[PDB]
Paper text:
Like E1 enzymes, aminoacyl [name] synthetases (aaRSs) are adenylate-forming enzymes (AFEs). They catalyze the transformation of amino acids into AMP conjugates, and then into aminoacyl-tRNAs, to supply protein synthesis. PfYRS is a Class I aaRS, characterized by a catalytic domain that adopts a Rossmann fold (residues 18–260) linked to a C-terminal domain (residues 261–370) that is involved in recognition of the anticodon stem of tRNATyr. PfYRS contains the two motifs characteristic of the catalytic domain of Class I (sub-class c) [name] synthetases: “HIGH” and “KMSKS” (70HIAQ73 and 247KMSKS251 in PfYRS).
Whole genome sequencing of one parental and three resistant clones revealed nine newly acquired mutations in the resistant clones, three of which were in [name] (position 403,556), corresponding to a Ser234Cys mutation in cytoplasmic PfYRS. YRSs from wildtype (PfYRS), mutant (PfYRSS234C) and human (mature HsYRS) were produced in Escherichia coli. Thus, it appears that the ability of PfYRS to catalyze formation of the [name]-Tyr conjugate is the primary factor controlling selectivity versus HsYRS and potency versus PfYRSS234C. That is, the decreased susceptibility of HsYRS and PfYRSS234C to reaction hijacking by [name] is associated with mobility of the KMSSS/KMSKS loop, which is, in turn, associated with rotation of the His49/70 side chain. These conformational changes may promote dissociation of the charged [name], thereby preventing the hijacking reaction.
Numbering used by the authors:
A (entry chain B): 15 to 245, 252 to 372
B (entry chain A): 17 to 243, 252 to 372
């Protein structure tokens, strides 16, 4: 009993570790993630969002699957409404009133994205920062003392900017603040897209500079590609798209036969549809011979390169399953009259 | 009647007194407009608690502040504690920075600034009272200027572009620029080494279409004593320290430019006594009382005043002006322990 209780505990951490890594395109030190799973408390994870218009399905549907996997494995998750960051980054022409409306719309979508809200929080940056402004801004100032300008300009990607354009001082303040959020929120796991990893590597550098041994674990998820080959409004599906809009965008999306690399249609099947249902039921023509079910990811790869999966069949299955997962969101913005007028209000905004 | 004619008399008199502080006031005509809107203008200067107080920040500041406050203005001493930490002063130790700040207040209250129209404000304390307004302003300023434009303000921190440029060197001038608006400052009265960030604040007004623009009233920099601790006189120097540093100081004959000894006589001693009594042996020219700066300058450039004679009187005058400060830190026990504490601090 005394020995058997140790063996089950070790295998318990091993399986929790392995399926947390399954949703990560890359993890900065899986050995550190195992150490954090051995602590008798829940791990704090977070992702941050600039309210700058309609919601990408990666931020609604893809996020719901990741947060569900983390909260079922001893983690709590924070949605960070980066309102002040969107203002600093000139989103919505910097209009703070519009940013807050888009933030409220994001929370309305997330609340009906099929997530489990028992261990999930929605926190607003400006609210939390002004609750403890001495601690927060002292962190920001101490981070600015630690890195030079060129080191910080390597984080431009986290705000969708580049060195080719005019670099405003806000592009130095922004990554200092995002880096400070990681410690301000006492985050254990930084669960953001790979486009944010530069500033998360910075936070780990800051721990070694300041001799902080509680370094955050970076658990970056891959970026869902654009629908067109080599990746405006038709580049991805959004949470408010209708059943007709999804079918139209998927129909003209890039889906090369017998090839899965850079295939956004297949990428939707692997990252969105499959983890939602834990299977993929490929329905086909009325008599040609379809309605087949898959169960793991490895057999999905082997059969698309095999030719048993036609492009029109994969696209129509992807488009159909995307519409099923989006229907709880459409139903909420149809029956709940207050959210319906909220959606109509933010759709009249001009995307900057 | 003739009561309107005496109104321009009062305004033009205050104009002349205030404009005498700076050699290049940014638009004197705007200053006259501010005085007609209200007499109680708000002036400020800001200080990093980074060690012992330079006499420019004590004896020279007192000359400037009392000129402004006697004309109905308010003067804010901005004890820039967070800026000193951001600039790596006192090894960034905030507890020692606060200690130096308290010592700065004790010097100022004993060298002519214990008065109702002077306020001692701490940066961290005031920012934390209205943090949403302050930091929103810092962020909006950062959105309005690019990196190269902000790196021009490096001089306000005592840095240069040839050294390693940290991100704190971008945040610092954003926060100093915000202070001008946060404090509702009418007149920025700082040394000319701070002028570039004040010009930035006026650019920010034109970008934001803000009509209330600050007037920049920058005073000249006292040159350094050398051509460390000996490159300047400090408010806590003893008589022997002042005499030693003056004697070994730079004082080129016939040349007043970059002359710290002549600068102390012209900017500190002459305004304090409305004269300069040059004590000399008869064979060296004999005692002479200077009533104007024009004759003082003419005599020095023509060789009538040898540098040794100027040094001896300047050192004697500096020691007489530091006497209220010394008596305060010698007699007041709590001020004595404060100075003794900050003396053993290492500078960085
Ligand atoms: N196609 C895709 N596939 C997979 N993941 C994707 C996307 C995508 O597409 C996009 F164009 F909409 N975004 N994301 C991910 O969603 C989240 C928000 O996105 S964001 O608004 O851009 N956030 C920022 O810019 C961050 N500086 C905001 C921020 C601020 C302070 C913090 O303390 C933490 C974060 C981040 O995690 C992103 O990685
Ligand atoms: N030799 C001299 N002759 C004539 N004036 C002199 C000096 C001298 O010598 C020196 F080395 F000690 N300082 N000053 C003047 O004293 C004051 C404070 O000086 S400081 O501590 O350096 N503060 C800074 O630099 C400022 N960025 C701090 C600051 C921060 C936020 C604000 O909202 C405003 C200001 C400023 O007005 C300076 O011009
Ligand atoms: Cl506030
Ligand atoms: Mg007072
Ligand atoms: Mg004599």
């Amino acid at each position: 009993e005394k020995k058997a209780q140790e063996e089950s505990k070790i295998e318990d951490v091993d399986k929790i570790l392995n399926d947390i890594l399954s949703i990560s395109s890359e993890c900065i030190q899986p050995d550190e993630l195992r150490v954090k799973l051995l602590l008798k408390r829940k791990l704090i994870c977070y992702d941050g969002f600039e309210p700058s218009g309609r919601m990408h399905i990666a931020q609604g549907l893809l996020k719901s699957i990741i947060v569900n996997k983390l909260t079922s494995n001893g983690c709590t998750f924070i949605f960070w409404i980066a309102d002040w960051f969107a203002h600093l980054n000139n989103k919505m022409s910097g209009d703070l009133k519009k940013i807050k409306k888009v933030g409220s719309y994001f929370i309305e979508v997330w609340k009906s994205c099929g997530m489990n809200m028992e261990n999930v929080q929605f926190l607003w940056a400006s609210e939390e920062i002004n609750k403890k402004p001495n601690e927060y801004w002292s962190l920001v100032l101490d981070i600015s003392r630690s890195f030079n300008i060129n080191r910080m300009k390597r984080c431009l990607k986290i705000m969708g900017r580049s060195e080719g354009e005019e670099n405003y001082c806000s592009q130095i303040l922004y990554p200092c603040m995002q880096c400070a959020d990681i410690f301000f929120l006492n985050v254990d796991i930084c669960q953001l897209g790979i486009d944010q990893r530069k500033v998360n590597m910075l936070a780990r550098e800051y721990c070694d500079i300041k001799k902080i041994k509680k370094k955050p674990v970076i658990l970056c998820h891959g970026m869902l590609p654009g629908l067109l080959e080599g990746q405006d409004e038709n580049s991805a599906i959004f949470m408010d798209d209708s059943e007709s809009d999804v079918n139209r965008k998927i129909k003209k999306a890039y889906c090369p036969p017998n090839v899965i690399e850079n295939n956004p249609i297949y990428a939707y099947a692997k990252s969105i549809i499959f983890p939602s249902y834990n299977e993929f039921n490929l329905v086909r023509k009325e008599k040609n011979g379809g309605d087949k079910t898959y169960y793991t990811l490895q057999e999905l790869e082997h059969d698309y390169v095999n030719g048993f999966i036609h492009p029109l069949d994969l696209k129509d299955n992807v488009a159909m399953y995307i519409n099923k997962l989006l229907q709880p969101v459409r139903d909420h913005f149809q029956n709940n009259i207050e959210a319906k007028n909220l959606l109509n209000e933010i759709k009249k905004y001009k995307v900057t």
